[PDB]
């Protein structure tokens, strides 16, 4: 392609029109047709009612050393719209047709606007049930006044009914699973808007790779349609366990299962746990997204743990239900056991315990504390995303919290908010931009402070990439009774190695947090379809902070003030998210730009995903 030459074009220069050409080289394979239609629309959308391409030529240089492309353009004048007259077999919807048809006098003629008008008429009729209308628009060009008059031949046809709804490709999921997401009922008229919502709904569940639809005419009658959906199920969940032996751990093992769709019945369940010489963990989670036909949900979980010191276990059950097509509410009850022993003296912990009414001796680790509290939890969600696992549009909001009730030992509240917004960058969704924020705050009631084991933590791929998990925030300050680990202990904890109160690197968590990031999601043209189809990468800037409320910076005058929320940490990097057939995997590389003492960094991170 040595050059493209436009012959006889005076309205615009070459660069202005060439900027819209894509064949800007060898082996173009006649792709030029795409550019010529684009040129026609450029003029046809600008009022040049008489624009016509008369001929094109492609010329080769000697020995195929280059290509010469020339186009012969005939230009006309600019035309304006004079009005639109619509007639035909219209089913009484004259006001809606007039409202969509009406144009502003003097508006430049635009072929695209005419096509858009036709599409709006077809969509309206489809909404009422006229599945196959015929609309034919034509211009009338009046050279006497440089105007175009429009006429549209509209044929609504007739009403269609859906005789049956069938599904194919549902080899594993129970048939009831797909019928629950249809809004079109059998034995009723075919409003076209209702079928598309069903198509969208089956992609909201996240159990399928793709959803196809059809509206096939019934061969036995001109007025009936059979609607057929085709799905391709993907692997949903995995099962893992393991065990090993050695002198550093004796014998330990882990196991658990999690699925979003249990044996194809629609239930979401999962069980996991682990046991070793120092820690015990178990979890059971079962929920039914459709307890009742209308989609009231129920679920809950049980857990047990200990550590060799503390011990805890508890239970919760949550009820929830929708309140419109895009919003739902949740609420539930639960119980948590909290028993502490052999607690290492800490300033934050002991201030909490003193407020609770405890009176441990200074630096005495030979202690314990246990309470049994009853609480209530609640939340609110919004979800208008158009995809299950790789959203391209919409937004999601998750506002949750819990409170204590009379009879409990602790008195506290906690509120968190999870939001994300997807906005397409490209017309064809090659590039996508992702915004993410998290916010949270909580504290005690009645003069008490929140238990230290409920504090917020950050770091790791779940919050701010590039920092070690649960490391962002204020660090523990240890008191200088007895310890047999002096020979194996913290300098600020041992009564012999230190004689005063001082800071260490152990994070204690905070009463408030803020996390935000911006990601630019890029296509991966350098990765073949086998892998590229399930992976996206993005460029990002991450920031956030954690700080302590009720921090006595006046008493601890020699240490940093943990109440200052302005010490914002920031980092940025590149992350990859791959929906592996064996479970989605994520990793990223990022570097810090702003850090404070103790902000240990982890520039490269890897973990199992399946989040968001």
């Amino acid at each position: 392609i040595q050059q493209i030459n436009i012959v006889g074009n005076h309205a615009f220069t070459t660069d202005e029109l060439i900027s819209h050409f894509q064949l800007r080289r060898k082996y173009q394979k006649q792709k030029l047709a795409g550019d010529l239609e684009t040129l026609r629309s450029y003029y046809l959308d600008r009022g040049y009612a008489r624009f016509n391409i008369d001929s094109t030529q492609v010329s080769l240089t000697p020995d195929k050393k280059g290509i010469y492309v020339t186009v012969n353009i005939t230009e006309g004048d600019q035309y304006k719209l004079s009005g639109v007259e619509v007639s035909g077999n219209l089913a009484g919807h004259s006001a809606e047709i007039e409202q969509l048809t009406k144009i502003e006098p003097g508006e430049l003629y635009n072929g695209t606007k005419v096509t858009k008008m036709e599409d709006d008429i077809k969509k309206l009729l489809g909404r009422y049930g006229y599945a196959y209308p015929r609309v034919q628009s034509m211009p009338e060009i009046n050279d006497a006044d440089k105007t175009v008059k429009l006429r549209v031949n509209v044929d609504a046809g007739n009403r269609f009914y859906v005789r049956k709804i069938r599904f194919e490709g549902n080899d594993t999921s129970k048939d009831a699973v797909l019928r629950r997401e249809m809004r079109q009922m059998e034995g009723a008229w075919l409003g076209s808007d209702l079928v598309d919502q069903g198509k969208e709904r089956l992609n909201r569940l996240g159990f399928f790779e793709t959803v196809d639809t059809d509206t096939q005419r019934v061969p036995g009658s001109p007025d009936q349609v059979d609607v057929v959906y085709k799905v391709k199920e993907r692997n949903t969940g995995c099962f893992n366990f393991g065990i090993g032996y050695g002198t550093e751990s004796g014998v330990s093992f882990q196991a658990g299962v999690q699925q979003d769709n249990w044996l194809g019945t629609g239930y979401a369940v999962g069980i996991n746990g682990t046991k070793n010489d120092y820690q015990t963990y178990a979890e059971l989670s079962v929920t039914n997204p459709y307890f009742t036909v209308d989609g009231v949900s129920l679920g809950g979980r049980l857990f047990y743990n200990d550590f060799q010191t503390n011990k805890s276990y508890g239970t919760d059950v949550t009820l929830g239900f929708p309140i419109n097509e895009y919003n739902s509410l949740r609420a539930g009850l639960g119980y948590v056991h909290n028993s502490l022993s052999n607690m290492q003296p800490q300033v934050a912990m002991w201030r909490y315990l003193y407020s609770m009414g405890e009176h441990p001796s200074t630096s005495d680790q030979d202690n314990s504390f246990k309470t049994d509290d009853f609480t209530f939890n609640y939340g609110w969600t919004y979800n208008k995303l158009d995809r299950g696992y790789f959203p391209t549009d919409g937004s999601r909001v998750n506002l949750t919290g819990k409170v204590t009730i009379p009879g409990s030992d602790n008195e506290y509240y906690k509120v968190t908010l999870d939001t994300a917004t997807y906005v397409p960058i490209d017309d064809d969704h090659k590039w996508v931009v992702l915004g993410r924020t998290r916010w949270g705050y909580g504290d005690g009631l009645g003069g008490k402070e929140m238990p230290f084991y409920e504090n917020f933590y950050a770091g790791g791929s779940s919050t701010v990439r590039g920092f070690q998990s649960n490391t962002i925030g204020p660090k523990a300050v240890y008191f200088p009774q007895a310890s047999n680990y002096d020979p194996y202990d913290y300098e600020c904890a041992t009564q012999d190695g230190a004689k005063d109160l001082c800071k260490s690197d152990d994070a204690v968590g905070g009463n408030a947090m803020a996390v935000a990031s911006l990601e630019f999601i890029t296509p991966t043209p350098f990765i073949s379809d086998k892998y590229a189809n399930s992976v996206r990468t993005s460029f990002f800037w991450d920031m956030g902070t954690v700080w302590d409320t009720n921090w006595d910076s006046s008493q601890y005058s020699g240490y940093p003030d943990y109440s200052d929320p302005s010490n914002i940490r920031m980092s940025a990097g590149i992350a990859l998210q791959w929906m592996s057939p064996l479970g989605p995997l994520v990793f990223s590389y990022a570097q810090p730009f702003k850090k404070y003492d103790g902000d240990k960094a982890e520039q490269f991170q890897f973990n199992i995903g399946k989040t968001w």
């Binding site: 969940g237 893992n240 090993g244 032996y245 057939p581």
Partner: peptide
Amino acid sequence: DNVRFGLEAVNANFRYCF
């Protein structure tokens, strides 16, 4: 099919996906 396992102190694990 679509599984991973092995044996390694001694350590072992297994994964199965649906």
